[PDB]
Structures are given as structure tokens and as C-alpha cells.
Symmetry: C2
Subunit: 85 residues, 2 copies
């Protein structure tokens, strides 16, 4: 029952106007109910990132594990935020 809801929710999950940190927390919370393997989860996680994070990621060699990709994207966000100020 949880798995069905999770597969729907994760596909709709977006960073959108919000932060990588909140997106990543919600993503891992939902993904714990999924039986997708790590490559599929990485691709879904990337799909939901905001355009500006995806643009920054395109300049970099992207981590090939989900936890490392989350760390990479959080760092990108933190850097852009510190630059804004």
C-alpha cells in the first residue's frame, strides 16, 4: 500500500521553487517505500531538481550514488546562496 502511494508521489516530487535540502529529505522519505534500485532512484532524483541546479550539475562530473549526488547538489545550492549574499 505504501509502495503504490510512493511510486505516484516520487514521480510528482519536484524541487520547484524550493530548496535542494527539502527536496532531498522528502525524496529519501518517499524512496524508503520503493523497490527501485539506486540507478533508477538517481535518475528520478535528477529529474526533479530545479533547472538552475541541473544547469550547475551539467558542468560537473556527477556522482554515481544517490547519497553522494544529494551531497553534491546541496553543496551547489549552499554555494549559490552564499554568493547571493
Amino acid at each position: 500500500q505504501r509502495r503504490e502511494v510512493a511510486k505516484r508521489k516520487i514521480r510528482r516530487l519536484r524541487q520547484g521553487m524550493g530548496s535542494v535540502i527539502d527536496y532531498s529529505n522528502a525524496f529519501q522519505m518517499i524512496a524508503q517505500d520503493l523497490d527501485w534500485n539506486e540507478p533508477a532512484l538517481i535518475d528520478q532524483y535528477h529529474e526533479g531538481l530545479s533547472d538552475h541546479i541541473q544547469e550547475e550539475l551539467s558542468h560537473l562530473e556527477v556522482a554515481k550514488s544517490l547519497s553522494a549526488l544529494i551531497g553534491q547538489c546541496i553543496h551547489i545550492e549552499r554555494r549559490l546562496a552564499r554568493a547571493a549574499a
Copy 2:
């Protein structure tokens, strides 16, 4: 290779049965997926996501497929049941 994998992960997510046949959709899906490293649960869920609504609705009256081939076979039989002369 990594490049084929990147292409595959974008193409599989945009692939849709639309107004076309289950067999054409399924052959295209499996062709793309040969270059992916997603496990069978993730492929099942993506395949379902791309089906036409009229096939998806009829799936609810059937046993839940536990393999990609089983789901494809169900959809082929549903299509044959619904097809106009």
C-alpha cells in the same frame, strides 16, 4: 556505456503509447531499456506510466503483474479485447 545510458534514461521517460499499439510501445520500451541499468520494478512502473489511459484502467481488473513480460502480456490481451473492427 555511460553515454547510451544517459540517452536511454531521458528517452524512456518521454516514451508514450499514445494512440499507438501496445506492441510498438513495448518493443520501443524494451529497445531503450536494453541500455538502462534500472531494475525490473522501476521498469514496470515506468512502462505503466507511459501506457494509454484506456489500457491502464483495464489493468485494475487483473492480477498485479510481477514481471515486465507479464505486464506487457496483460496489456497486449487488453488491447486485443478492446480493439474496434
